[PDB]
Design goal:
This is part of a larger assembly, with 10 copies of chain A and 1 copy of chain B (48 residues). By secondary structure, chain A is mostly helical. In chain A, 96% of the residues lie in helices and 0% in strands. Chain A is built from 1 helix and no strands. The N and C termini of chain A lie far apart (70 Å). In chain A, 0% of the residues are buried. By secondary structure, chain B is mostly helical. The chains are: A mainly alpha (46), B mainly alpha (48). Chains in contact: A-F, A-G, B-C, B-E, B-F, C-D, C-E, D-H, E-F, G-K, H-I, I-J, J-K. At the A-G interface, α1 of A face α1 of G. Chains A, D, E, I, K: It is a single-pass type I membrane protein. Chains A, D, E, I, K: It is found in: Virion; Host membrane. Chains A, D, E, I, K: Belongs to the inovirus capsid protein family. Chains A, D, E, I, K: Keywords: Capsid protein, Helical capsid protein, Host membrane, Membrane, Signal, Transmembrane, Transmembrane helix, Virion.
């Protein structure tokens, strides 16, 4: 079944890409939450 | 409180996360009375 | 008109939802006005 | 002209649909404005 | 009519999917409303 | 049903995330109420 | 992997930008806290 | 010009709507200023 | 060159349409800014 | 370069608009600071 | 390889366009940040 092998390869590659993607989100989401909290607390203090 | 009795879109604001608010709300009312009784004894001769 | 039938159904559904909403807003506005009174009575 | 009659029919149907549509907007826009004003006045009062 | 049976099957499947979908919305909408109210009341208190 | 399996997985995942969120909100709301008390005690 | 190379470049770039941002926020927050003190000292 | 005719119609319609809006804003702004006065007269 | 004349006609028509469009934007943008300022000043006054 | 010509035109246009904007903001900020002073002088 | 030369030309042109684009962003982003800060400080002052 030429098809089975090919479909299998594509799924493998896709899984790898999702891995790299999860990494990037954490870096950006981290930064954004960081900046927000600093601004919020500072304003409440004075 | 139940929004949408009987319909596919039925949801309920639960009590577990409302009971926690009543806990913080009690505290913030006692603190604000202790700081009133106190400060009115201290300024009893200062004609307010 | 296969469209008239459909448009009528969606209006009926919308009316039902606005009813449920007018309920929820009176429960929440009640609470908000009740926190604002008690805090005032407590702090000059 | 087979075409003329056909184009005429399509316009007729379209006009009818716009009618049904105007009705729906009024019901939704009414509700939204209603809820907004109630919330606004209540907050200003206390 | 081969077509009639086929159209019928597709509608059946579609109805099932809408069912699963309504379930998911309730879980997410519940959470969102929950978090909002907690934050609102807390701020008004002090 | 290859769809039932999928829909079930996504609901499971969602439930897990709401749990982590209910944690984060109690840490942040704590902080905010704590800045607001101390400032008050300090300024008439 | 022609994708690994690309994903790595974009993360590197992102890290650089967050650095520049943490700078800008401390200059602006400084200013805001400085306007709020002076106004207070001036008006009961 | 089958476009000139169309563009002219849409401008006419827009002008009509802005008229109705300038009405609604004076009814709502009235109310808001009226709640704010009465509350003031009542609370130091 | 049949093409040159045709391309020229299309550009001419396009320029005219941009003219009609600039007119409409001014009417709408005018109104929006108007309503905003009224609301802002009123709130600051009392 | 048929693109260089185009990009240059759009930058020129943008610069002109920012000029008109820096004008409008000084007229509006003036007004806002002027309502806030008069109200203060009037109410303790 | 007719293809190699052609692919090379396209990349060259693309790089140039990105250059012109970075310039425009700086002009607009500059202005926007400028107007924001002026408004913010003014409001905090009085």
């Amino acid at each position: 079944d030429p098809a089975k092998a090919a479909f299998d390869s594509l799924q493998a590659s896709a899984t790898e890409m999702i891995g790299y993607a999860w990494a990037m989100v954490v870096v950006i989401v981290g930064a954004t939450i960081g900046i927000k909290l600093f601004k919020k607390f500072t304003s409440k203090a004075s | 409180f139940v929004f949408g009795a009987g319909k596919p879109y039925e949801f309920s604001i639960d009590c577990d996360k409302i009971n926690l608010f009543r806990g913080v709300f009690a505290f913030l009312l006692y603190v604000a009375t202790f700081m009133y009784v106190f400060s009115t004894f201290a300024n009893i001769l200062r004609n307010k």
